């Protein structure tokens, strides 16, 4: 409801990591 | 916000089909904020109850 709001909302945190290394490959860190 | 004169939700059943919706009566300068509120709360039933 409100759990499914965040249980969705933290995988856009991760859709954004599939995206955050998609072009830059930030390497050393 | 006084954006209508009256509002009513309906639900009709038939042998094979049906109809589910909302009926409203309003003044011609309120139709944007009324249509936002109707569609916002019907779609919220699929997300957050």
């Amino acid at each position: 409801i409100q759990p499914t709001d965040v249980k969705a909302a933290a995988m856009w945190g991760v859709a954004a990591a599939t995206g955050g290394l998609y072009l830059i490959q930030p390497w050393g860190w | 916000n006084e954006v209508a004169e009256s509002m009513m939700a309906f639900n009709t059943n038939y042998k094979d089909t049906g109809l589910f919706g909302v009926y409203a009566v309003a003044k011609p300068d309120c139709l944007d904020d009324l249509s936002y509120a109707i569609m916002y709360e019907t779609t919220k039933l699929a997300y957050r109850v």
């Binding site: 969705a8 995988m11 856009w12 991760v14 859709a15 954004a16 599939t18 995206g19 998609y22 | -």
Partner: protein
């Protein structure tokens, strides 16, 4: 036609696999097209590369 409901069945009913698919699908597609341009190139030009120089090692 049954693959069309089944592919919408699983992934995009929300923004889960939408702003992640389009990113990760931008990669497999960019590597599928960079591979085909890089093999149509070395098939139109045989005998013209740098490693096809017969006297390469030997200047002296």
């Amino acid at each position: 036609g049954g693959i069309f409901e089944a592919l919408y069945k699983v992934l995009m009913r929300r923004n889960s696999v939408y702003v992640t698919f389009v990113i990760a699908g931008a990669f497999v597609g960019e590597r599928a097209v960079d591979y085909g341009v890089h093999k149509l190139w070395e098939h139109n030009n045989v005998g013209k590369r740098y490693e096809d120089i017969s006297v390469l090692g030997q200047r002296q």
